[PDB]
Amino acid sequence: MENKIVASTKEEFNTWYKQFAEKHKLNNKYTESASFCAEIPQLDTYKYKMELASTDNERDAIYSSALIEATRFCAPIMECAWASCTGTVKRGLEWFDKNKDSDTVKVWDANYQKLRTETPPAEALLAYQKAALNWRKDVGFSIGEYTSILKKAVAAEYKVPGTVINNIKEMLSDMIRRRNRIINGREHLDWCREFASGKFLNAFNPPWGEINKAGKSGYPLLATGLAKLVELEGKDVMDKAKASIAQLEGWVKENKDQVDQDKAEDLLKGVRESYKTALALAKQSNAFRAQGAQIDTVFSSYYWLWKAGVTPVTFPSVSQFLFELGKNPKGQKKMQKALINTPLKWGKRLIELFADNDFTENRIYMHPCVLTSGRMSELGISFGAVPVTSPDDAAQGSGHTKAVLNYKTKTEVGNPCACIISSLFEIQKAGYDIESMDIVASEHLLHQSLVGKRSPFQNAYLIKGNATNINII
């Protein structure tokens, strides 16, 4: 049981990877990172087999067989190997020994048993999301685009082929409808947007009346207005609002001779109260509670290993387990038996972290540290695409759902990412009742693809904008 991907620095890993890549002839023709993808799999045969299937096990077998076929050869071999390497493994686990007692980790880890049943508070999500960015900085996880924090804007348009466009619009429409269920004075929004975007002198002339006028709810209209702008455009609006209010202070002190200093101070104290009231409403809202529960794949992966008592000695058994798991068409219930039956100790402890039975609320709200049967794909993509005890076996191929994000987005090669996502959705709706399911995996794959997530190992919590507002073309 030796981890054969030996590399304790960025430079030592590159010497391993270039040696591995030129051996196996890794192909970046159809994928974003270099992979074993020599062709785009045509999955329509599974959609038609699914139409004819009668029992639930057959549909599970057809659906998993479709996912294996789709994903087995197209894993990001650079980023997978980087996550699984001896350096990243030792540093990644030991961070939790170093950081468990801090504010950003303890709020969710010490309450793990509570979060298995209950939905988390808003600050526990913010704690998690800070700790994830701390983990990436302290370990030094970024070695390029596909392992970095994304700080980009959401794109205005998303370019899909003509053969799939109709089904992509049905998925997005269902995502819009799902966004509306979790959620549940017209020029005010346009004025509040103008103010936040930089026109700070608007605050002297609020169209409703005084700057701190309360609406029907009893909350300031500037707070309500900024809070609704968070739900429509994203939490980037509150960063812009704080930048505008700073300029308002700068102008009032630059031009004290033009103003009544009492009413200027009553204005600035009023705007700061409405800003904090807008933060309180945004965190309290369901739109944030879903957004904040976004899993950082590799961070939560390493958290679950540390929670199950895994060390650098026992890591290769986990990597080897996840590799073999992604080869056979395995239903989620069969995997639970495999973790029970395996004599290794982590196998038992990892099954006890599952929260499949006892979570009554909507699963989108579940805190992203809690493991489930579906979230084993987060571990599978992290450590399972390349087995560390025998790296060459990767050429066989190990299917993981998060390997679909490695497919290209470019119309030059027919946009294989959108075609696989579209085809997988047709397979799911044919076999399973879609609106009964809380999270549909193909809709979750599309949501990441829309916001510009090109790899499972990227963090994308700090993306400016919404996937909901995008146009399909």
Residue numbers in the entry: 1 to 184, 197 to 485
How do the authors describe this structure?
Hazara virus (HAZV) is a member of the Bunyaviridae family of segmented negative stranded RNA viruses, and shares the same serogroup as Crimean-Congo haemorrhagic fever virus (CCHFV). The genomes of CCHFV and HAZV comprise three negative sense RNA segments, named small (S), medium (M) and large (L), which encode the nucleocapsid protein (N), the viral glycoproteins (Gn and Gc) and the viral RNA dependent RNA polymerase (L), respectively. As with all SNS RNA viruses, these RNA segments are encapsidated by the nucleocapsid protein (N) to form ribonucleoprotein (RNP) complexes. Genome encapsidation by N is required for multiple stages of the virus life cycle, including replication and transcription of the viral genome, as well as segment packaging during virus assembly.
We have determined the crystal structure of HAZV N to a resolution of 2.7 Å and found the structure of HAZV N to be very similar to the structure of CCHFV N, supporting the use of HAZV as a model for CCHFV infection. The crystallographic asymmetric unit (AU) contains four HAZV N monomers. In each of the four HAZV N monomers in the AU, only 475 amino acid residues were built into the model; residues 187–196 are missing in the electron density and are thought to form a disordered loop that links the arm domain to the N terminus of the globular domain. In agreement with the circular dichroism data, HAZV N is mostly alpha helical (helices are numbered according to Fig. 4b) and is composed of two distinct domains, a globular domain and an arm domain. Interestingly, HAZV N and the CCHFV N monomers in the AU of all three CCHFV N structures are packed in a similar way, with the base of the globular domain of one monomer making contact with residues on the arm domain of the adjacent monomer. HAZV N has a positively charged ‘platform’ adjacent to the arm domain (left) in a similar position to a positively charged platform on the surface of the CCHFV N protein. Superposition of HAZV N with CCHFV N strain Baghdad-12 reveals that the globular domains of these proteins align extremely closely (RMSD = 0.70 Å, over 368 residues that share 63 % sequence identity), as do the arm domains (RMSD = 0.89 Å over 107 residues that share 48 % sequence identity). The arm domain of CCHFV N is rotated by 74.0° around a pivot at serine 297 when compared with the arm domain of HAZV N resulting in a translation of 27.1 Å of the tip of the arm domain (the Cα of Asp 266).
